[PDB]
Amino acid sequence: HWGYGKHNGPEHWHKDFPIAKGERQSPVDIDTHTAKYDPSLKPLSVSYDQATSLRILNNGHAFNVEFDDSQDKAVLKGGPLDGTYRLIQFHFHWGSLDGQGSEHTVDKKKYAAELHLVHWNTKYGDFGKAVQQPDGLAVLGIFLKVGSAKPGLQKVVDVLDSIKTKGKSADFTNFDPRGLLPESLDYWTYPGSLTTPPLLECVTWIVLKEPISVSSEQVLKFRKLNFNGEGEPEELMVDNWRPAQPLKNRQIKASFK
Ligand SMILES: NS(=O)(=O)c1cccc2ccccc12
Ligand code: NA
Numbered sequence: 001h002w003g004y005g006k007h008n009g010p011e012h013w014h015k016d017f018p019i020a021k022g023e024r025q026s027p028v029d030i031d032t033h034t035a036k037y038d039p040s041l042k043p044l045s046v047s048y049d050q051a052t053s054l055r056i057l058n059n060g061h062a063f064n065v066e067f068d069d070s071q072d073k074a075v076l077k078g079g080p081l082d083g084t085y086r087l088i089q090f091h092f093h094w095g096s097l098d099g100q101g102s103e104h105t106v107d108k109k110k111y112a113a114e115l116h117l118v119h120w121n122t123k124y125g126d127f128g129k130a131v132q133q134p135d136g137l138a139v140l141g142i143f144l145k146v147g148s149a150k151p152g153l154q155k156v157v158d159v160l161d162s163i164k165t166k167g168k169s170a171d172f173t174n175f176d177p178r179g180l181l182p183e184s185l186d187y188w189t190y191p192g193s194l195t196t197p198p199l200l201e202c203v204t205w206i207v208l209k210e211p212i213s214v215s216s217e218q219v220l221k222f223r224k225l226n227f228n229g230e231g232e233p234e235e236l237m238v239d240n241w242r243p244a245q246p247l248k249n250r251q252i253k254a255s256f257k
């Protein structure tokens with residue numbers, strides 16, 4: 001039922017997922033002036049050297065690149081985190097136009113897209129248990145602006161034609177997610193939620209200050225995907241982003257400045 005249209009989009013979600021109006025929903029506007037620098041925050045540790053990608057899937061909301069998370073191979077730790085979190089999948093949110101697409105905003109600025117690298121806390125043993133816990137997930141968010149191409153994104157863009165419609169998947173081995181990272185790992189962090197249903201409040205958000213640049217042709221290829229299944233009327237996969245939600249009783253911390 002849920003999606004991103006006029007009849008089933010974010011403003012509808014609370015009727016099936018009442019936690020939509022909860023106390024720690026994501027995304028949020030990052031007010032850079034009122035984020036608190038925390039000199040006690042550690043550098044983020046991204047260990048993606050042994051990442052094993054398996055498959056790329058159109059799930060009718062976005063596309064996910066999924067990883068083997070049955071051993072410590074690609075993990076996030078340090079930063080604001082206490083445990084080790086294993087990479088399970090990444091996906092993106094993007095706009096119909098270059099002026100929108102990101103979920104988090106920075107002083108109300110919207111980027112063309114946002115990458116989410118989703119990781120789960122290994123003390124909970126698997127992803128399904130982790131989403132049930134307030135510290136179960138860590139999502140590393142990276143903004144995309146349109147400019148020069150990102151060469152490390154091209155293998156992704158080039159397979160999209162093979163998973164055009166909802167439910168299609170393709171083998172996707174040997175993809176290296178390190179090729180999607182900006183140079184700096186300076187970040188903001190705050191406790192929040194999944195940004196799609198079921199909107200569970202299990203996420204430590206870590207959002208990088210530095211965006212990556214992708215080319216207009218790269219983002220154009222994202223916009224050719226389809227929300228609909230094969231042999232249904234074409235609905236282009238665009239504007240699959242949830243708007244900023246009330247910060248409520250939360251402080252965004254910054255690792256820098
Ligand atoms: N948009 S997102 O909040 O990164 C997100 C999308 C889909 C599933 C997720 C599972 C766990 C954590 C986050 C997830
Ligand atoms: Na294994």
Ligand SMILES: [Zn+2]
Pocket residue numbers: 091092093116195
């Ligand atoms: Zn996401």
